[PDB]
Amino acid sequence: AGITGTWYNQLGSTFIVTAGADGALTGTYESAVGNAEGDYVLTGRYDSAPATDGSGTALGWTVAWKNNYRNAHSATTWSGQYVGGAEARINTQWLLTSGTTEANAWKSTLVGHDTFTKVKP
Amino acid sequence: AGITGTWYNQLGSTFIVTAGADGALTGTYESAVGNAEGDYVLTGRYDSAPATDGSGTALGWTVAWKNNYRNAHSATTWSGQYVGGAEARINTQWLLTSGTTEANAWKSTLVGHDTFTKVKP
Amino acid sequence: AGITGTWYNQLGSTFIVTAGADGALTGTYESAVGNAEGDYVLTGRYDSAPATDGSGTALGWTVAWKNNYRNAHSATTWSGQYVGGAEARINTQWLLTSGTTEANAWKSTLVGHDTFTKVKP
Amino acid sequence: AGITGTWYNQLGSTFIVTAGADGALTGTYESAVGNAEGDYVLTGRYDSAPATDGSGTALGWTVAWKNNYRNAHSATTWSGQYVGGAEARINTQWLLTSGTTEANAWKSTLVGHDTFTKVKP
Numbered sequence A, B, C, D: 001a002g003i004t005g006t007w008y009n010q011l012g013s014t015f016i017v018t019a020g021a022d023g024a025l026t027g028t029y030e031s032a033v034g035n036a037e038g039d040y041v042l043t044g045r046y047d048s049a050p051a052t053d054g055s056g057t058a059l060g061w062t063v064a065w066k067n068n069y070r071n072a073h074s075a076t077t078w079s080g081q082y083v084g085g086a087e088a089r090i091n092t093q094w095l096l097t098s099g100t101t102e103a104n105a106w107k108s109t110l111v112g113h114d115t116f117t118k119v120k121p
């Protein structure tokens, strides 16, 4: 129940997600940067029975950057963990792969990290 | 239509996916390695209108490593592109995040790469 | 001249480096976490003629985790950029590879990110 | 003694390195792709007393992409392990950071993987 809701990262992007009882993540993502405009569909999975020892809750999700406004021919996955409590966070690393020619595949994938909080930066 | 079906990676893992008309990926993943046994639910997204210039089709998906057999308290995301043709491939990089304590969060995430083909290694 | 000196990251680790006129980085690294004790040799490279348009200065370095105290059978590389000015930073992502058996090579490499500043956290 | 010498990756790039007795890597790197021409200085570190149980030898190195021909305002680090024997390899993952403006720092770093062998692809 800690994951469902709206999350904001350090770039100004916004992430609205519903966490289903058995592990589904669904929602929408709006990026403040890049070749992106409006909301994009997201889907992912999370550990619906995490450890109870103070460990975070593992999760991940994907956005393909095609919507009613634009198609960037790219997709990002975020992998990370939810940490609950008063200053809850989802700490992630991400991989953004663009469709490329075979000759350019070596430079197809960017890597970065986003930290999400329940309140805006 | 090139993405739907069964895929095999260099580790001996197996990936069965359906690519929906508007960008959804759904299916199951069976890992040959790690703290894993049986099939796990996967969900993701792909670019349903890729470029037609020889560029690959961007995609990503997530597995949370909880199923009827085991719970590893972890999740992997694969980010990559589908390359069609006679020797079709899905070339990926992945991030595997384990739920950790805050003190151990610096070592929460493994990175690697998997190449998937339509035939077994 | 902005890079030479002592840097501190969010984990409490300390990085003393000399940037040579033609691109060399040399120094020592002390990690506050992990299988590490004391100072370890570091070496790397940086762009000694960066752009002057407000872009950062690309750089990277490596530590192998063997010194007079311990040998962790591992090595980390940090890749990033130096950003000068009043609140100077070195923003990095890193890869930590452990020596593994072939069967375990898929889980040989951790990924993360460190931000270094001139003052302690 | 297994690391010293010339190595070739899947892209057609060439890596000549000397491994010093106490952990230093020095040499030159020539990339077959990207904003690169000629040889570039490399420096890094390796575990000079690896485990003897069949585990690989952890290592890493950096190239800043500035030489007598070009300056790409970028640097790559490779992190990986050397695996000896008849078909020796250095298996790596790499991070390529470009100097960027602060607004573009989110897209500063590419990630990939290179496999090096003693003979050309």
Ligand SMILES: O=C(O)CCCC[C@@H]1SC[C@@H]2NC(=O)N[C@@H]21
Pocket (backbone or CB within 6 Å): A009, A011, A013, A030, A031, A032, A033, A034, A035, A036, A065, A072, A074, A075, A076, A094, A096, A112, A114, D106
């Ligand atoms: O430019 C593109 O190809 C599509 C937009 C990508 C935006 C990226 S996803 C990772 C990072 N986190 C964000 O919130 N935005 C950027």
Ligand SMILES: O=C(O)CCCC[C@@H]1SC[C@@H]2NC(=O)N[C@@H]21
Pocket (backbone or CB within 6 Å): B009, B011, B013, B030, B031, B032, B033, B034, B035, B036, B065, B072, B074, B075, B076, B094, B096, B112, B114, C106
């Ligand atoms: O050990 C775990 O935490 C769960 C199993 C992880 C298996 C990983 S996912 C990335 C890589 N590719 C595979 O097919 N298996 C491993």
Ligand SMILES: O=C(O)CCCC[C@@H]1SC[C@@H]2NC(=O)N[C@@H]21
Pocket (backbone or CB within 6 Å): B106, C009, C011, C013, C030, C031, C032, C033, C034, C035, C036, C065, C072, C074, C075, C076, C094, C096, C112, C114
């Ligand atoms: O545990 C090991 O194998 C050796 C110590 C690794 C410490 C890592 S390097 C990346 C991160 N940044 C730090 O300052 N410490 C950790």
Ligand SMILES: O=C(O)CCCC[C@@H]1SC[C@@H]2NC(=O)N[C@@H]21
Pocket (backbone or CB within 6 Å): A106, D009, D011, D013, D030, D031, D032, D033, D034, D035, D036, D065, D072, D074, D075, D076, D094, D096, D112, D114
């Ligand atoms: O384009 C640049 O910024 C400089 C050249 C980068 C070449 C990269 S380094 C990682 C990969 N492995 C290679 O051998 N070449 C590419």
